[PDB]
Coordinates of C-alpha atoms and ligand atoms in Angstrom, one line a residue:
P15 CA 0.0 0.0 0.0
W16 CA 0.9 3.7 -0.6
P17 CA 0.8 6.4 2.0
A18 CA -1.7 9.3 1.3
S19 CA 1.2 11.8 0.7
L20 CA 3.0 9.5 -1.8
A21 CA -0.2 8.8 -3.7
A22 CA -1.0 12.6 -3.8
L23 CA 2.3 13.1 -5.7
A24 CA 1.1 10.6 -8.4
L25 CA -2.4 12.1 -8.4
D26 CA -1.0 15.6 -8.9
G27 CA 1.2 14.3 -11.8
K28 CA 4.5 14.8 -9.9
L29 CA 5.4 11.1 -10.0
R30 CA 5.9 10.1 -13.7
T31 CA 6.5 6.6 -15.2
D32 CA 6.3 7.6 -18.9
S33 CA 9.1 6.7 -21.3
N34 CA 9.9 10.4 -21.9
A35 CA 10.4 11.1 -18.1
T36 CA 12.5 7.9 -17.5
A37 CA 14.7 8.3 -20.6
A38 CA 15.7 11.8 -19.8
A39 CA 16.8 10.7 -16.2
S40 CA 18.7 7.6 -17.6
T41 CA 21.6 9.5 -19.3
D42 CA 24.4 11.7 -17.9
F43 CA 27.2 14.0 -19.1
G44 CA 29.7 11.0 -19.2
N45 CA 27.5 9.4 -21.9
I46 CA 29.2 6.0 -21.2
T47 CA 26.6 4.3 -18.8
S48 CA 22.8 4.4 -18.8
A49 CA 20.3 3.2 -16.2
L50 CA 16.5 3.5 -16.6
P51 CA 14.6 4.5 -13.4
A52 CA 11.1 3.1 -12.5
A53 CA 9.8 6.6 -11.9
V54 CA 10.8 10.3 -11.9
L55 CA 9.6 12.8 -9.2
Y56 CA 9.2 16.5 -10.2
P57 CA 8.8 18.1 -6.7
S58 CA 7.2 21.5 -6.4
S59 CA 8.2 22.0 -2.8
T60 CA 10.5 20.3 -0.1
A61 CA 7.3 18.7 1.5
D62 CA 7.2 16.5 -1.7
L63 CA 10.7 15.3 -1.0
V64 CA 9.8 14.7 2.7
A65 CA 6.7 12.7 1.4
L66 CA 8.8 10.4 -0.8
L67 CA 11.6 9.9 1.8
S68 CA 9.2 9.4 4.7
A69 CA 7.2 6.8 2.5
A70 CA 10.5 5.1 1.8
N71 CA 11.4 4.9 5.5
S72 CA 7.9 3.9 6.7
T73 CA 7.3 1.2 4.0
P74 CA 8.5 -2.3 5.0
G75 CA 10.5 -3.8 2.1
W76 CA 10.6 -0.5 0.1
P77 CA 12.5 -1.6 -3.0
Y78 CA 13.1 1.7 -4.7
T79 CA 16.6 3.4 -4.5
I80 CA 16.5 7.2 -4.7
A81 CA 18.8 9.6 -6.7
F82 CA 18.8 13.4 -6.7
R83 CA 19.5 14.6 -10.3
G84 CA 21.0 18.1 -10.4
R85 CA 22.0 18.7 -14.0
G86 CA 23.3 15.1 -14.4
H87 CA 26.9 16.3 -14.9
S88 CA 28.0 12.9 -13.4
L89 CA 30.5 10.9 -15.5
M90 CA 29.7 7.3 -14.6
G91 CA 26.0 7.1 -13.5
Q92 CA 26.3 8.7 -10.1
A93 CA 22.9 10.5 -10.5
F94 CA 20.9 7.3 -11.6
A95 CA 18.4 5.2 -9.6
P96 CA 18.3 2.0 -11.7
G97 CA 14.7 0.7 -11.4
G98 CA 14.1 3.3 -8.7
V99 CA 13.1 6.9 -8.3
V100 CA 15.1 9.8 -9.8
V101 CA 14.3 13.2 -8.2
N102 CA 14.2 16.0 -10.9
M103 CA 15.7 18.7 -8.5
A104 CA 15.3 21.6 -11.0
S105 CA 11.5 21.3 -10.5
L106 CA 11.9 23.0 -7.0
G107 CA 12.9 26.2 -8.8
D108 CA 9.9 26.3 -11.2
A109 CA 7.3 28.5 -9.2
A110 CA 9.6 31.7 -9.3
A111 CA 7.7 32.6 -6.0
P112 CA 9.0 32.3 -3.3
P113 CA 12.6 32.9 -4.5
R114 CA 15.1 30.1 -4.3
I115 CA 18.2 32.4 -4.0
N116 CA 18.3 35.1 -1.3
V117 CA 21.3 37.3 -0.5
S118 CA 21.4 38.2 3.2
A119 CA 20.4 41.7 4.4
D120 CA 24.1 42.2 5.6
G121 CA 25.6 40.9 2.4
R122 CA 27.7 38.3 4.2
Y123 CA 26.1 35.2 2.6
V124 CA 23.8 33.8 0.0
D125 CA 20.9 31.3 0.6
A126 CA 20.4 29.1 -2.4
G127 CA 18.2 26.0 -3.1
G128 CA 20.2 22.8 -3.6
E129 CA 18.8 22.5 -7.1
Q130 CA 20.0 26.0 -8.2
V131 CA 22.8 26.4 -10.8
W132 CA 25.9 28.4 -9.9
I133 CA 25.4 30.8 -12.9
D134 CA 22.0 31.9 -11.3
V135 CA 23.6 32.1 -7.8
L136 CA 26.2 34.4 -9.4
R137 CA 23.6 36.6 -11.2
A138 CA 21.5 37.0 -7.9
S139 CA 24.6 37.8 -5.8
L140 CA 26.0 40.4 -8.4
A141 CA 22.6 42.2 -8.4
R142 CA 23.4 42.8 -4.6
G143 CA 27.2 43.7 -5.3
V144 CA 28.5 40.4 -3.8
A145 CA 29.7 37.0 -5.1
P146 CA 30.7 33.5 -3.8
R147 CA 34.5 33.2 -3.1
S148 CA 35.1 29.6 -4.3
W149 CA 33.9 28.3 -7.7
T150 CA 34.0 25.5 -10.3
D151 CA 35.3 26.0 -13.9
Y152 CA 31.8 25.4 -15.3
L153 CA 28.8 27.3 -13.7
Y154 CA 25.9 25.1 -15.1
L155 CA 26.1 22.7 -12.1
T156 CA 23.9 22.6 -9.0
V157 CA 24.8 23.8 -5.5
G158 CA 23.7 20.4 -4.2
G159 CA 25.7 18.5 -6.8
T160 CA 29.0 20.4 -6.4
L161 CA 28.7 20.3 -2.6
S162 CA 28.2 16.5 -2.6
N163 CA 31.7 16.2 -4.3
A164 CA 33.9 19.2 -3.3
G165 CA 33.6 22.0 -5.9
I166 CA 37.1 23.1 -7.1
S167 CA 38.6 25.8 -9.4
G168 CA 41.6 28.3 -9.3
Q169 CA 40.3 30.0 -6.0
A170 CA 40.4 26.8 -3.9
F171 CA 44.1 27.3 -2.9
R172 CA 43.2 30.4 -0.9
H173 CA 39.5 29.9 0.0
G174 CA 39.3 26.1 0.0
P175 CA 36.9 24.1 -2.1
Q176 CA 33.1 25.0 -2.2
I177 CA 32.6 22.6 0.7
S178 CA 34.8 24.9 2.9
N179 CA 32.6 27.9 2.1
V180 CA 29.2 26.7 3.5
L181 CA 27.8 28.3 6.8
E182 CA 24.8 25.9 7.0
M183 CA 22.4 23.7 5.1
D184 CA 18.8 22.2 5.1
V185 CA 19.0 18.4 4.5
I186 CA 16.2 15.8 4.3
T187 CA 17.7 12.6 5.6
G188 CA 16.9 9.0 4.4
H189 CA 14.5 9.0 7.4
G190 CA 12.6 11.8 5.6
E191 CA 13.3 14.3 8.4
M192 CA 14.0 17.9 7.4
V193 CA 17.2 18.9 9.4
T194 CA 19.0 22.3 9.5
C195 CA 22.8 21.8 10.0
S196 CA 26.2 23.6 10.5
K197 CA 29.4 23.2 12.7
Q198 CA 27.3 24.3 15.8
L199 CA 24.0 22.4 15.0
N200 CA 23.9 18.8 13.8
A201 CA 27.7 19.1 12.8
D202 CA 27.9 15.3 12.1
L203 CA 25.3 15.6 9.3
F204 CA 26.8 18.8 8.0
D205 CA 30.3 17.2 7.8
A206 CA 29.0 13.9 6.4
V207 CA 26.9 15.6 3.6
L208 CA 29.8 17.9 2.4
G209 CA 31.8 15.7 -0.1
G210 CA 29.1 13.1 0.9
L211 CA 28.2 11.9 -2.7
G212 CA 24.4 12.2 -2.0
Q213 CA 24.5 9.2 0.5
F214 CA 23.0 10.8 3.6
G215 CA 20.2 13.0 2.3
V216 CA 19.2 15.7 -0.1
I217 CA 20.5 19.3 0.4
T218 CA 17.5 21.7 -0.1
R219 CA 19.3 24.8 0.9
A220 CA 22.9 25.8 1.3
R221 CA 24.1 29.1 2.9
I222 CA 27.2 30.1 0.9
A223 CA 29.8 32.6 2.1
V224 CA 30.2 35.7 -0.2
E225 CA 32.7 38.5 -0.7
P226 CA 32.2 42.1 -2.2
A227 CA 32.0 41.6 -6.0
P228 CA 35.1 42.6 -8.0
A229 CA 34.2 44.3 -11.3
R230 CA 37.0 43.1 -13.5
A231 CA 39.6 40.3 -13.7
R232 CA 43.1 40.8 -15.1
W233 CA 43.7 37.4 -16.7
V234 CA 47.2 36.2 -17.5
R235 CA 48.9 33.2 -19.2
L236 CA 52.6 32.4 -18.6
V237 CA 54.4 29.8 -20.9
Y238 CA 57.0 27.2 -19.7
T239 CA 59.0 24.4 -21.5
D240 CA 60.3 23.1 -18.1
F241 CA 57.9 21.3 -15.8
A242 CA 60.2 22.0 -12.7
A243 CA 59.9 25.8 -13.3
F244 CA 56.2 25.5 -14.1
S245 CA 55.3 23.6 -10.8
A246 CA 57.7 25.7 -8.7
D247 CA 55.9 28.9 -9.9
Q248 CA 52.4 27.5 -9.3
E249 CA 53.5 26.6 -5.7
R250 CA 55.0 30.1 -5.3
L251 CA 51.8 31.8 -6.5
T252 CA 49.6 29.6 -4.2
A253 CA 51.9 29.3 -1.1
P254 CA 50.6 30.9 2.2
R255 CA 52.5 34.0 3.4
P256 CA 54.3 33.8 6.8
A261 CA 46.3 31.7 6.6
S262 CA 47.5 34.7 4.5
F263 CA 47.9 34.2 0.7
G264 CA 49.5 36.1 -2.2
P265 CA 47.8 38.6 -4.5
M266 CA 46.5 36.1 -7.1
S267 CA 42.7 35.6 -7.0
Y268 CA 42.9 32.4 -9.2
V269 CA 45.7 30.0 -10.2
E270 CA 45.3 27.1 -12.7
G271 CA 47.5 25.5 -15.2
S272 CA 47.5 23.5 -18.4
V273 CA 49.6 20.9 -20.2
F274 CA 50.0 20.9 -24.0
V275 CA 51.4 17.9 -25.8
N276 CA 53.7 18.8 -28.8
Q277 CA 51.7 16.7 -31.4
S278 CA 48.6 19.0 -31.2
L279 CA 50.4 22.1 -29.8
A280 CA 49.3 24.7 -32.5
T281 CA 45.7 23.4 -32.5
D282 CA 45.3 23.2 -28.7
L283 CA 46.8 26.7 -28.2
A284 CA 44.3 28.1 -30.7
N285 CA 41.5 26.2 -29.0
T286 CA 42.1 27.9 -25.6
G287 CA 40.3 31.0 -26.8
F288 CA 43.0 33.0 -25.0
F289 CA 45.9 33.1 -27.6
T290 CA 46.0 35.0 -30.9
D291 CA 47.6 33.4 -34.0
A292 CA 50.7 35.5 -33.4
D293 CA 50.9 34.1 -29.7
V294 CA 50.5 30.5 -31.1
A295 CA 53.3 30.9 -33.7
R296 CA 55.7 32.3 -31.0
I297 CA 54.9 29.4 -28.6
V298 CA 55.2 26.8 -31.4
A299 CA 58.7 28.3 -32.4
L300 CA 59.7 28.3 -28.7
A301 CA 58.8 24.5 -28.2
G302 CA 60.8 23.7 -31.4
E303 CA 63.8 25.7 -30.2
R304 CA 63.7 24.0 -26.8
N305 CA 62.9 20.6 -28.5
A306 CA 60.0 20.2 -26.0
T307 CA 57.6 17.2 -26.1
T308 CA 55.3 19.1 -23.7
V309 CA 54.5 22.9 -23.1
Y310 CA 53.1 24.2 -19.8
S311 CA 51.0 27.2 -19.1
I312 CA 50.1 29.0 -15.8
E313 CA 46.6 30.6 -16.0
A314 CA 46.1 33.3 -13.3
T315 CA 43.8 36.2 -12.3
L316 CA 43.9 39.4 -10.3
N317 CA 40.4 40.5 -9.4
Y318 CA 39.7 44.3 -9.1
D319 CA 36.9 46.9 -8.8
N320 CA 35.5 49.9 -10.8
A321 CA 37.9 52.3 -8.9
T322 CA 39.7 55.0 -10.9
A323 CA 43.2 54.0 -9.6
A324 CA 42.3 50.3 -10.0
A325 CA 43.7 49.4 -13.5
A326 CA 47.1 51.1 -12.8
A327 CA 47.3 49.5 -9.3
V328 CA 46.8 46.0 -10.8
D329 CA 49.4 46.7 -13.6
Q330 CA 51.9 47.5 -10.8
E331 CA 50.8 44.6 -8.6
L332 CA 51.1 42.1 -11.5
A333 CA 54.5 43.5 -12.7
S334 CA 55.8 42.8 -9.1
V335 CA 54.3 39.3 -9.1
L336 CA 55.6 38.5 -12.6
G337 CA 59.2 39.6 -11.6
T338 CA 59.3 36.8 -8.9
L339 CA 58.6 34.1 -11.5
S340 CA 60.6 32.0 -14.0
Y341 CA 58.4 31.7 -17.2
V342 CA 60.2 32.0 -20.6
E343 CA 61.4 35.6 -21.0
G344 CA 58.7 37.6 -23.0
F345 CA 56.0 34.8 -22.6
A346 CA 53.5 36.7 -20.4
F347 CA 50.1 37.1 -22.1
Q348 CA 47.3 39.4 -20.7
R349 CA 43.5 39.8 -21.2
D350 CA 41.2 42.2 -19.2
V351 CA 37.5 41.1 -18.9
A352 CA 34.5 41.8 -16.7
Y353 CA 34.5 39.3 -13.7
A354 CA 31.3 37.4 -14.7
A355 CA 32.7 36.8 -18.3
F356 CA 35.8 35.2 -16.8
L357 CA 33.6 33.2 -14.4
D358 CA 31.3 32.0 -17.2
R359 CA 34.2 31.5 -19.7
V360 CA 33.5 27.7 -20.1
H361 CA 29.9 28.3 -21.3
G362 CA 31.2 29.7 -24.6
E363 CA 33.1 26.4 -25.3
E364 CA 29.9 24.4 -24.5
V365 CA 27.9 26.3 -27.2
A366 CA 30.8 25.8 -29.8
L367 CA 31.3 22.1 -29.0
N368 CA 27.5 21.4 -29.1
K369 CA 27.1 23.0 -32.6
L370 CA 29.9 20.7 -33.9
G371 CA 28.3 17.7 -32.2
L372 CA 31.2 17.3 -29.7
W373 CA 29.4 18.0 -26.4
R374 CA 27.0 15.0 -26.4
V375 CA 29.8 12.5 -27.0
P376 CA 31.4 10.2 -24.3
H377 CA 33.6 11.9 -21.6
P378 CA 36.1 9.3 -20.2
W379 CA 37.5 12.0 -17.9
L380 CA 40.3 11.2 -15.4
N381 CA 40.2 13.5 -12.4
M382 CA 42.6 13.0 -9.5
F383 CA 44.5 14.6 -6.6
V384 CA 48.2 13.8 -6.8
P385 CA 50.6 14.5 -3.8
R386 CA 53.1 17.4 -4.5
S387 CA 56.2 15.1 -3.9
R388 CA 55.1 12.9 -6.9
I389 CA 53.8 15.5 -9.5
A390 CA 57.2 15.5 -11.4
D391 CA 57.0 11.6 -11.6
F392 CA 53.4 12.0 -12.7
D393 CA 54.5 14.5 -15.4
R394 CA 57.3 12.1 -16.7
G395 CA 55.1 9.0 -16.7
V396 CA 51.9 10.6 -18.1
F397 CA 52.5 13.9 -20.0
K398 CA 56.0 12.9 -21.2
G399 CA 55.1 9.2 -21.3
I400 CA 51.6 7.5 -21.7
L401 CA 50.0 10.5 -23.5
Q402 CA 52.8 11.0 -26.0
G403 CA 52.1 10.1 -29.7
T404 CA 48.3 10.1 -29.1
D405 CA 45.6 12.5 -30.5
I406 CA 44.3 14.5 -27.5
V407 CA 40.9 16.1 -27.6
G408 CA 40.1 18.1 -24.5
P409 CA 42.1 20.1 -21.9
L410 CA 44.8 18.8 -19.6
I411 CA 44.5 20.8 -16.3
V412 CA 47.1 20.8 -13.5
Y413 CA 47.2 23.1 -10.4
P414 CA 48.2 22.9 -6.8
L415 CA 45.9 23.0 -3.7
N416 CA 46.6 23.7 0.0
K417 CA 45.4 21.0 2.4
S418 CA 45.1 23.6 5.2
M419 CA 42.0 25.0 3.3
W420 CA 40.3 21.5 3.3
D421 CA 38.3 20.1 6.3
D422 CA 39.4 16.5 6.9
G423 CA 36.3 15.8 9.1
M424 CA 34.1 16.4 5.9
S425 CA 33.4 13.3 3.6
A426 CA 35.7 14.5 0.8
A427 CA 39.0 12.5 0.5
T428 CA 42.3 14.3 -0.2
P429 CA 46.0 13.1 -0.2
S430 CA 47.9 13.4 3.2
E431 CA 50.5 16.0 1.9
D432 CA 50.1 19.8 2.6
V433 CA 50.3 20.6 -1.2
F434 CA 48.5 18.4 -3.7
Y435 CA 47.6 18.8 -7.4
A436 CA 44.2 18.7 -9.0
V437 CA 44.9 16.7 -12.2
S438 CA 42.0 16.8 -14.7
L439 CA 42.4 15.1 -18.1
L440 CA 39.2 16.0 -19.8
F441 CA 39.2 13.5 -22.7
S442 CA 36.4 13.9 -25.3
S443 CA 35.7 10.6 -27.3
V444 CA 35.3 10.9 -31.1
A445 CA 35.0 7.4 -32.7
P446 CA 33.9 4.1 -31.0
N447 CA 37.6 3.1 -31.5
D448 CA 38.4 6.1 -29.3
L449 CA 36.1 5.3 -26.3
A450 CA 37.6 1.8 -25.6
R451 CA 41.2 3.2 -26.2
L452 CA 40.6 6.2 -23.8
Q453 CA 39.1 3.9 -21.1
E454 CA 42.2 1.5 -21.3
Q455 CA 44.5 4.6 -21.3
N456 CA 42.9 5.8 -17.9
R457 CA 43.3 2.2 -16.5
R458 CA 47.0 2.4 -17.6
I459 CA 47.5 5.9 -16.0
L460 CA 46.1 4.6 -12.7
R461 CA 48.3 1.3 -13.0
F462 CA 51.4 3.5 -13.5
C463 CA 50.5 5.5 -10.4
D464 CA 49.8 2.3 -8.3
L465 CA 53.1 0.7 -9.5
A466 CA 55.1 4.0 -8.8
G467 CA 53.7 4.2 -5.3
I468 CA 51.7 7.5 -5.8
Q469 CA 49.2 8.1 -3.0
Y470 CA 46.6 9.9 -5.2
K471 CA 42.8 10.3 -4.5
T472 CA 40.4 10.1 -7.4
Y473 CA 37.9 13.0 -7.9
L474 CA 34.4 12.6 -9.6
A475 CA 35.0 8.8 -10.0
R476 CA 32.9 6.0 -8.6
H477 CA 34.7 2.8 -7.6
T478 CA 33.0 -0.7 -8.2
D479 CA 34.9 -2.6 -5.5
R480 CA 34.4 -2.2 -1.7
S481 CA 38.3 -2.5 -1.2
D482 CA 38.7 0.6 -3.5
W483 CA 36.1 2.8 -1.6
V484 CA 37.8 1.8 1.8
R485 CA 41.2 2.8 0.3
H486 CA 39.7 6.0 -1.2
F487 CA 38.5 7.3 2.2
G488 CA 41.2 5.6 4.3
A489 CA 40.0 2.9 6.8
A490 CA 39.5 5.2 9.9
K491 CA 37.5 7.7 7.7
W492 CA 35.6 4.8 6.1
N493 CA 34.1 3.7 9.5
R494 CA 33.0 7.3 10.1
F495 CA 31.3 7.3 6.6
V496 CA 29.6 4.0 7.4
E497 CA 28.5 5.3 10.9
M498 CA 26.9 8.3 9.2
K499 CA 25.2 6.0 6.6
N500 CA 23.7 3.9 9.5
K501 CA 22.3 7.1 11.2
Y502 CA 21.0 8.8 8.0
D503 CA 20.3 6.2 5.3
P504 CA 19.8 2.8 7.1
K505 CA 17.9 1.4 4.1
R506 CA 20.8 2.2 1.7
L507 CA 18.5 3.8 -0.9
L508 CA 20.3 7.1 -1.5
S509 CA 22.4 7.8 -4.6
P510 CA 23.0 4.1 -5.6
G511 CA 25.0 5.1 -8.7
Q512 CA 28.1 5.9 -6.4
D513 CA 28.3 2.0 -5.9
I514 CA 29.4 2.4 -2.2
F515 CA 26.5 0.6 -0.5
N516 CA 24.7 -0.5 -3.7
Ligands
FAD1 C1 29.8 18.2 -16.7 C2 30.9 19.1 -16.0 C3 31.1 18.8 -14.7 C4 32.1 19.4 -13.9 C5 32.9 20.5 -14.6 C6 32.6 20.8 -16.0 C7 31.6 20.1 -16.7 C8 31.4 20.5 -18.1 N1 33.8 21.3 -13.9 C9 34.0 21.1 -12.6 C10 35.0 21.9 -11.8 O1 35.6 22.8 -12.4 N2 35.1 21.6 -10.5 C11 34.4 20.6 -9.8 O2 34.6 20.5 -8.7 N3 33.5 19.8 -10.5 C12 33.3 20.0 -11.8 N4 32.4 19.2 -12.6 C13 31.7 18.1 -11.9 C14 30.5 18.6 -11.1 O3 30.9 19.1 -9.9 C15 29.8 17.2 -10.9 O4 29.4 16.6 -12.2 C16 28.7 17.1 -9.8 O5 28.0 15.9 -9.9 C17 27.7 18.3 -9.8 O6 26.9 18.2 -11.0 P1 25.3 18.1 -11.0 O7 24.8 19.4 -10.3 O8 24.9 18.1 -12.4 O9 25.0 16.8 -10.1 P2 24.5 15.3 -10.5 O10 25.6 14.8 -11.5 O11 23.1 15.4 -11.0 O12 24.5 14.6 -9.2 C18 25.8 14.2 -8.6 C19 25.6 13.3 -7.4 O13 25.2 14.2 -6.3 C20 23.8 13.9 -5.8 N5 23.1 15.2 -5.7 C21 22.7 16.1 -6.6 N6 22.0 17.1 -6.1 C22 22.0 16.8 -4.7 C23 21.4 17.5 -3.6 N7 20.8 18.7 -3.7 N8 21.6 17.0 -2.3 C24 22.3 15.8 -2.2 N9 22.8 15.0 -3.2 C25 22.7 15.6 -4.5 C26 23.2 12.9 -6.9 O14 22.2 12.1 -6.3 C27 24.5 12.2 -7.5 O15 24.9 11.1 -6.7
LIG2 C1 56.4 18.0 -32.4 O1 55.4 17.4 -33.2 C2 55.4 17.7 -34.6 C3 54.5 16.7 -35.4 O2 53.2 17.2 -35.6 C4 56.9 17.5 -35.2 O3 57.1 18.1 -36.5 C5 57.2 17.1 -37.6 O4 58.2 16.0 -37.5 C6 58.4 15.2 -38.7 C7 59.7 14.4 -38.5 O5 60.9 15.1 -38.9 C8 58.3 15.9 -40.1 O6 58.4 15.0 -41.2 C9 57.0 16.7 -40.1 O7 56.8 17.3 -41.4 C10 56.9 17.7 -39.0 N1 55.6 18.4 -38.9 C11 55.3 19.7 -38.5 C12 53.8 20.0 -38.6 O8 56.2 20.5 -38.2 C13 58.1 17.7 -34.2 O9 59.1 16.7 -34.6 C14 57.8 17.3 -32.7 N2 58.9 17.6 -31.7 C15 59.3 16.7 -30.7 C16 60.4 17.2 -29.9 O10 58.8 15.6 -30.4
ZIR3 C1 37.6 19.5 -12.2 C2 36.9 19.6 -13.5 C3 36.0 18.5 -14.0 C4 37.1 20.7 -14.3 C5 36.4 20.7 -15.5 N1 36.3 22.1 -16.1 C6 36.3 22.2 -17.4 N2 35.4 21.4 -18.1 C7 35.3 21.5 -19.3 N3 36.1 22.4 -20.0 C8 36.9 23.3 -19.4 C9 37.0 23.2 -18.1 N4 37.9 24.1 -17.7 C10 38.3 24.7 -18.8 N5 37.7 24.2 -19.8 C11 38.0 24.7 -21.3 O1 39.4 24.5 -21.6 C12 39.9 25.7 -22.3 C13 40.7 26.6 -21.3 O2 41.9 27.0 -21.9 C14 38.8 26.4 -22.8 O3 38.5 25.9 -24.1 C15 37.8 26.2 -21.7 O4 36.4 26.3 -22.2
NAG4 C1 25.1 8.9 -25.6 O1 24.5 10.1 -26.1 C2 24.0 9.9 -27.5 C3 23.4 11.2 -28.1 O2 22.4 11.8 -27.2 C4 22.9 8.7 -27.5 O3 22.8 8.2 -28.9 C5 23.2 7.5 -26.5 O4 21.9 7.0 -26.0 C6 24.1 7.9 -25.2 N1 24.7 6.8 -24.6 C7 24.8 6.5 -23.2 C8 25.5 5.2 -22.9 O5 24.2 7.2 -22.4
NAG5 C1 65.0 16.0 -28.9 O1 64.0 15.3 -28.1 C2 63.8 13.9 -28.5 C3 62.5 13.4 -27.9 O2 62.3 13.9 -26.6 C4 65.1 13.1 -28.3 O3 64.9 11.6 -28.4 C5 66.1 13.7 -29.3 O4 67.4 12.9 -29.2 C6 66.4 15.2 -29.0 N1 67.4 15.8 -29.8 C7 68.3 16.8 -29.4 C8 68.2 17.2 -28.0 O5 69.2 17.3 -30.1

């Protein structure tokens, strides 16, 4: 039998079993794995989510696993509920009254619904002259989705990931109980949920820290032929000052393989054809099989003295660095245009039919002491001679800005690198080849003794998830699963308890 509140959802057309509803919630960004759910819930309010989760907890032998689909940006089916119920989170923001994004009266934080996309959180914040401090490279992801992972970009070295910038949340547990949580109130749930992979409950609201909005971003690219000089400069730009960080607002980096150098430099959207020819000539002079580039920003406001002050600040920063003499490249954009820079590449790849293709992405955190071994074995090794489609992103992070009590797993070293090899598959020949190449990259790391952590990946073996979190942290994760999802129905696509 069905509880009155669960039957009401079906009666009001919120619970859909039609082929159109189930097919849309069966595919994800990865475009490698598919899993048809039994039904899709389109909730109009948080009471509808309470109704489904309470009906799940109060029904003996409830056989339906529950997933919370944000924008389905998952790579390997993490947002699916195979033969279960997929919640279409975007449906919470339909009404337009009451608002789902509210900047505080004091301008110190922003309240956003878990389903809200970061681009909208940015627009609503900017209208009040404020903006979140820590971002993702791509803004068309949900607050709830990015918080269930970590949420990383070039600001994470100084502000920590997005999980380190949450004051409090509203979470409906697997028991169907609406719970408000922070470090002071229900801290256990707050910590379990952040980096929690949708295992403990659905985030319906997150209170995000903000800062006064800068108006412009001075955006620079620095070119290296030497990995040692590239990595030493990224660590110098991101190192804490003797808590306190340097002037850079953002620090990322990219790897360019010699084989597709001219094409990949042109595809950045940053370099002119004159910049490309100079870098191509540089690589050939140096006899480089790889080229490296630091990507950095200096945020600033609409002040009269602003531009000249950033010119002087940047000149001082650049002087402390070791990039190839004369290889500093500058752009000056409005802040929101730099934040939403990846959206332009999505539009261009989709028109060429290269967005809805498989994405066998390899994302990992590599300890600082092993990055040069990673570069030799991977960028200078495994990847050489292959045709690479997609960016190769490498940048350091500071462990001090990460909370180890949260669910997100990071390497034990103080400095570690975000390594994101964003492979785009073209032919069927390519998908299988790209998947074997990722298996070979991880095998190289395992055999060399590199203590990495995967990011955005779901493991299929219990021994792998135990190693991912570390045994002591794994028991904490399990304790939290027994308190918040005893029925093991939430986010089954992570393959931890399902
Ligand atoms: C597609 C993509 C993803 C991406 C990126 C660029 C692109 C083009 N750039 C990223 C970056 O620079 N930094 C970063 O940290 N992540 C980046 N990603 C990955 C993105 O964070 C993830 O794909 C993530 O899953 C968020 O995406 P989305 O919002 O689309 O979430 P989902 O895939 O549907 O769900 C992921 C898992 O989380 C659970 N979930 C979703 N919403 C909630 C709420 N509100 N509460 C609790 N759990 C939730 C799902 O059930 C699923 O398990
Ligand atoms: C970088 O890659 C390019 C290949 O695209 C190399 O340039 C070519 O090398 C062969 C061998 O002598 C020539 O026959 C081709 O005509 C060259 N092509 C172009 C487009 O220049 C270059 O050798 C590579 N460098 C390193 C150090 O590996
Ligand atoms: C941790 C994870 C998953 C990060 C994923 N982020 C990104 N995802 C997809 N494309 C990106 C990303 N960052 C930059 N680009 C593109 O790469 C080039 C930047 O030089 C541009 O073409 C830009 O649009
Ligand atoms: C991949 O996407 C394409 C285009 O939408 C589609 O033909 C196919 O069903 C998808 N494959 C998977 C495994 O999701
Ligand atoms: C240039 O580099 C290649 C490949 O890295 C190497 O095998 C070759 O001997 C080099 N030639 C020089 C340095 O003159």
